[PDB]
Design a protein around this ligand. Structure first.
Ligand SMILES: O=C1COc2ccc(C(=O)N3CCC(Cc4ccccc4)CC3)cc2N1
Ligand code: NA
Length: 295
């Protein structure tokens, strides 16, 4: 008699049978999160995390959104957090967009006729833009927190040289240095929390993944004149990771009839985990923006 193989486990050795999950088109398990209100939801909202991090970092934002009677859902992107895949590796950047679309499609089957929003930070913002651009008119709105539109110029110039060298030869281990965690937020407690989280990949950026982030930037640029989805864009003026010039480019080139930019003067990258004055404003602005578009 044949036997069923050992249960599939997360990279942290937890069986997927014990966790909310989804199997993607490549047969990879993605770890899922849900925050549903007690009553009938007004809308659905997918939360799209950034490079190296995971969906668990959106607990507070998701509970605020759930408090607005929205059903919030997320997953860890392939190669991240509790999902399968070699850490910080992706065959093509579109895998992330395809998987967001599978999860949105699955949720819309369980909750038909509901409007669907996207919330994305940084790489997760680039994924949200490409997701909305793939399906014009399907999403009700997008909330972008320091989305990856234009990388820091000095950082991108150094990386593009490193990328062309990997593209010309066989160097599977080549990586750039790790992200300077101090540039993430002026809130030192949040920098320390980021450095303490075992689900975060704090290793150097592998050149192959960096090339996919370069592809994301190129694709976002091409997608902008196709964008018609309503959006709220939040950007720090002192962001060393996603250049503020990218947020002005998105406001200028998107075709969306409903677009709003809020600049946080002197703020760093992770606006939803910045100094309390910034973070409280970020939560309040998202709250007002989504409440106005779900009323
Ligand atoms: O809360 C956190 C935790 O720490 C992070 C770390 C990374 C990012 C991120 O997604 N990118 C996009 C990619 C950026 C570099 C890049 C490389 C190559 C091309 C374009 C940009 C860096 C910033 C986001 C956060 N946010
Ligand atoms: Na379903």
């Amino acid at each position: 008699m044949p036997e069923e193989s050992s249960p599939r486990r997360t990279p942290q050795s937890i069986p997927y049978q014990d966790l909310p999950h989804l199997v993607n088109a490549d047969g990879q398990y993605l770890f899922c999160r849900y925050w549903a209100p007690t009553g009938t939801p007004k809308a659905l909202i997918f939360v799209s995390h950034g490079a190296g991090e995971h969906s668990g970092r959106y607990e507070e934002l998701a509970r605020m959104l759930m408090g607005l009677d929205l059903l919030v859902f997320a997953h860890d992107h392939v190669g991240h957090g509790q999902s399968e895949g070699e850490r910080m590796v992706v065959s093509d950047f579109h895998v992330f967009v395809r998987d967001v679309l599978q999860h949105v499609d699955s949720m819309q089957k369980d909750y038909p006729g509901l409007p669907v929003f996207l919330l994305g930070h940084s790489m997760g913002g680039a994924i949200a833009i490409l997701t909305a651009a793939e399906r014009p008119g399907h999403f009700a709105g997008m909330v972008l927190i320091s989305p990856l539109v234009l990388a820091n110029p000095e950082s991108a110039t150094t990386f593009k040289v490193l990328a062309a060298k990997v593209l010309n030869s066989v160097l599977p281990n080549l990586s750039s240095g790790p992200i300077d965690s101090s540039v993430l937020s002026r809130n030192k407690t949040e920098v320390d929390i980021y450095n303490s989280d075992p689900l975060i990949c704090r290793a150097g950026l592998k050149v192959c993944f960096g090339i996919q982030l370069l592809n994301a930037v190129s694709r976002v640029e091409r997608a902008l004149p196709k964008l018609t989805v309503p959006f709220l864009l939040l950007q720090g003026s002192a962001d060393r990771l996603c250049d503020s010039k990218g947020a002005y480019l998105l406001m200028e080139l998107a075709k969306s009839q409903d677009k709003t930019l809020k600049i946080y003067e002197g703020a760093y990258h992770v606006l939803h985990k910045e100094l309390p004055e910034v973070t409280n404003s970020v939560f309040h602005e998202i709250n007002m923006w989504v409440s106005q578009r779900t009323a």
